[PDB]
Each structure stands twice: as structure tokens, then as C-alpha cells.
Amino acid sequence: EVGEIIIARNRDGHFYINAFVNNVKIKFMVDTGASDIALTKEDAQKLGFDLTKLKYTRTYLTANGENKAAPITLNSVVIGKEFKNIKGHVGLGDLDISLLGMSLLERFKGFRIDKDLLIL
């Protein structure tokens, strides 16, 4: 179970974990802002989702336009523990890398960030 996870803040000012979503290594920007696990259309398609078969029931509206998005449920998400059926979505917006958000983070217990170091 569980873990103290520590994440050396990347060059670009964020940092990224790798999770095995349905044992596909997806690279995730760790985002407390994000509500759940926002899958880029690439990583959607990489996870064998059919972008023409998804129900795009949600809409992120940004400065530069609408970005429809599709609710899904990740069956397995392994950072090491396997979390089952973690709520996320497939963002057809300009969502250029995938998000590891609160849908996954709420299941933790304790938290701290910055200098260059996101601890869980």
C-alpha cells in the first residue's frame, strides 16, 4: 500500500510522475488545480480509447475557445499501489500533456510542495 512519494521539480517548473494507467506508462503533470485525471487525446488513443466513440458531455472554456471533454473511469492506475476506477476525462482541448489531479490525490494523506520538490 501507500507511500511517501517525492518529486524533483522539473526544469520547466512543474514535475511529472509516471503512472501505469491500465498498465500503459502515461507521463502525468502533477496538478493540484486539476479536478481529476485529464487525458490528452494522444494518451487517450494510446490507451486504446476511440476518440470518435467517447461521449463528450463536458466543456472546459478557455481564452482561446471551447474544449469539449469526455468522462471516463480509469480501471487501474499504478504509481505502485494500484488505484482502481479513478475518475478522469479525455480532453480534446489544447491539453498538451496529461494531468494527475485530485481524483487521485484525495486518496492520499498529507502533502507539501516547492523549492524544487513536490512531496506527497
User: Can you say whether the dihedral through the CA atoms of 78, 41, 70, 91 is positive or negative?
Assistant: positive
Q: Residues 54-83: x/- map of binding to a second copy (CB under 8 A)?
A: ------------------------xxxxx-
Q: Which residues lie closer than 8 Å to 34 by C-beta, 6 or more apart?
A: 99, 100, 101, 102
Distance CA 79, CA 83 (A): 8
The number of residues that bind Na ion (CB under 5 A) is: 1
Q: Which stretch binds a second copy (CB under 8 A): 11-19, 54-62, 89-97, 103-111?
A: 11-19
Indicate whether 23 belongs to the interface with a second copy (CB under 8 A): yes
Interface contacts to a second copy, rule CB under 8 A: 1-8, 10, 15-18, 20, 23, 25, 78-82, 120
